[PDB]
Amino acid sequence: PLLVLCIQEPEIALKRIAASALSDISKHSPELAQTVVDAGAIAHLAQMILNPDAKLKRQVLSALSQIAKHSVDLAEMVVEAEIFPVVLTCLKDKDEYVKKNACTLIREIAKHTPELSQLIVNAGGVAAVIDCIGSCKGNIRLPGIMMLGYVAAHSENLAMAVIISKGVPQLSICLSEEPEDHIKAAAAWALGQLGRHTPEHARAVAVTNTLPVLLSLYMSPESSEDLQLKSKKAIKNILQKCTYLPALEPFLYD
Amino acid sequence: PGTLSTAVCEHLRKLCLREFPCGIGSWNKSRFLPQKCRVWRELVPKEEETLVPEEETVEALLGLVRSNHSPWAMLKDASAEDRFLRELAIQNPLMIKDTFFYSYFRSLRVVNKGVSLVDKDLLKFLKLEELVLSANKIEEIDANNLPPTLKVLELYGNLIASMECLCSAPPPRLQHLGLGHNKLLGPLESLYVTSHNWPQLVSLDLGFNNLTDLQNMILGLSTLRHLRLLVLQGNPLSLVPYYRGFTIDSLAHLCVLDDITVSPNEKHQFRGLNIHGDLLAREAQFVVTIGNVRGVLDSSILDPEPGPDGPFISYSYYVTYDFVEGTVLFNTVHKPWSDVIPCTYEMKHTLKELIRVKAFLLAGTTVSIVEEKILSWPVLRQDPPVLTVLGSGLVYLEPLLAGEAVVSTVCNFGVVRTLETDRLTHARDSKKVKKSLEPLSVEVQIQLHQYRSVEEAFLSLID
């Protein structure tokens, strides 16, 4: 309760430190996050997202990410505090770690149930996340990639909402230009979750020239174990439903 | 696909011992990397959770493994200590190599490759006091790979020829051998469970093999002075009439046997049977009844009027059976129609071929009925008598091998008395009346005469 009361103080540094302490506390067990929630911290934390402070928004979004990462009910009640589209606007700030915090928060929100994913889609956040990923480079794209992958893996309507929102070419860009291993592993995982649904999924994925990239990447010795595993998983989930012969044709000889 | 070293080191490659969310890339550079990257983000004025993005939030990484969607339950699946191994590798990889993997496997239990070739690495996997490995196809072994360590050994789905290659290289430690779905044979392999090999045997799991004398196994236990967990229910050796009370009684070791709750009276009734077991008919001795005939085609309903010179009738109903010699056959139950018939046979078999007895009990043993109708002019005239029949069923009898006193099973060979023909069977006698006014099945019972008290088990003097 004292940490919650410390935020009500007008000191920006005190707010930042209290949010950092809350994030550090609610990242080890769901009961810590629940106890922080029961002190009324959700209502406050949503009220400083609009605050134009870099570090304050960073710490608030980090605490929200750490809270909404444990259980379904926590992530559900977090969205109940009207966190949209105030969080979605944070993907356009000049700051980068704020964008990473927002991507991580969204990723933790819509990983439990398709209802939260559906609410995010209806709030118009998938396009914003895709644009923020395309406008940024590095590990910042990873939370958004795992987000969109979880959303696609949730249900069929969510995968359609992602595909119509131009998610596949962004994933191809992630797989191509990012030199890091876990980023392209996550891109392969998201593409595989996209293409594991109806043949229209693997259709929309196959036009973007990702399958030859995945095949070459899983046929690359310098690749990591998890990356090759996820690339093979994506290939198996996409080629099991893809109905386009001219793109499955090159897979014959390679 | 595999040599043991190459398969272990391959699966150690299958478990990604250098890579995400375990292991190494960028993300490490202030969490799962060495110190400069970490510390200089402090000692240079704080590069914050701003992390340059050479790093992740590690709680996010852990949240990926914890995620109810990102795969990593084991991977999503198997032997749980392997997930701990991944969890260490998240926590920090850098230090870890084959050096640590060699340290890790105090047991090895990470099932299935279809592989079989034993080699050197097991020694290098320093700690291994246990194996539990399965769906691998091993036949006999580079025994030598035994580090001076091994206690417990499950081997489900291996194929092994004899114990001997391994047992002729024994660490004085083996608490257990187990070989489910396997094949091994006889009373004599008990020698490889002697004190030369394995004085330490506390535990056993030996089904699907074929092992054949409880007192040969007592020779092993007279030299493996340790037993407390067991599988003898599931081997041909259980077939001796006195087995439950004898096995409990036999030697200073097995404190409890087979499934049972004492809390009533049992234990006062039952200690003392192995003494009697020096005297009992020590082999296995089975009394075996055949069952009463059903689906009895009233082949006379086809003449529901039946009394005239062909139509008119007398019947046989018999089984012909497989029982192990694989196999010996008799035409057992033979006797005529009544709309339901009563028919029985009993054999007693005294048996020693316990591998094939176990094969007869487990495998699918083969059984048939024969019906005969008579349809006669006073000449009744009879075709054989007449034949009109079904007889085939595949049949199963494990409880005797589970050391239980009795099996029953009931076998339908298939329809000749259909329900319309059954209604009509009563209609043959009802059409004899109107004029005058399971589908083809047997029961089976197979006793291996076992018992309910120490004194009643003494009756196998007589077996």
Curated annotation (Swiss-Prot), chain A:
Coiled-coil region list: none
A GO term, aspect molecular function: microtubule binding
Localization per Swiss-Prot or TrEMBL: Cytoplasm, Cytoskeleton; Cell projection, Cilium, Flagellum; Cytoplasm, Cytoskeleton, Cilium axoneme
Phenotype on disruption: In null embryos the central apparatus is unstable leading to a loss, and presumably degradation of proteins to which SPAG6 normally binds, including SPAG16 and SPAG17.
GO cellular component, one term: cytoplasmic vesicle
Principal subcellular localization: cytoplasm
Cystine pairs: none
Tissue specificity comment: Highly expressed in testis. Not detected in prostate, ovary, spleen, thymus, small intestine, colon and peripheral blood leukocytes.
Repeat (ARM) residue spans along the chain: 1-27, 30-69, 72-111, 156-196
Keywords annotated in UniProt: Cell projection, Cilium, Cilium biogenesis/degradation, Cytoplasm, Cytoskeleton, Flagellum, Microtubule, Repeat
GO biological process annotation, one example: neuron projection extension
Associated clinical condition: Defects in Spag6 are a cause of hydrocephalus and of male infertility.
Function: Important for structural integrity of the central apparatus in the sperm tail and for flagellar motility.
Subunit structure: Interacts with SPAG16 and SPAG17.
Record's protein name: Sperm-associated antigen 6
Lineage, highest ranks first: Eukaryota, Metazoa, Chordata, Craniata, Vertebrata
UniProtKB/Swiss-Prot annotation, chain B:
Transmembrane segments: none
InterPro entries recorded: Cilia_flagella_integrity (IPR050576), LRR_dom_sf (IPR032675)
Domain LRRCT: 235-273
Compositionally biased region (Basic residues): 431-437
LRR repeat locations: 127-148, 149-170, 173-192, 200-221
Domain of life according to the entry: Eukaryota
Keywords annotated in UniProt: Leucine-rich repeat, Repeat
Stated name of the protein: Leucine-rich repeat-containing protein 43
Organism encoding this protein: Mus musculus
Top-level taxonomy: Eukaryota, Metazoa, Chordata, Craniata, Vertebrata
Recorded name of the encoding gene: Lrrc43
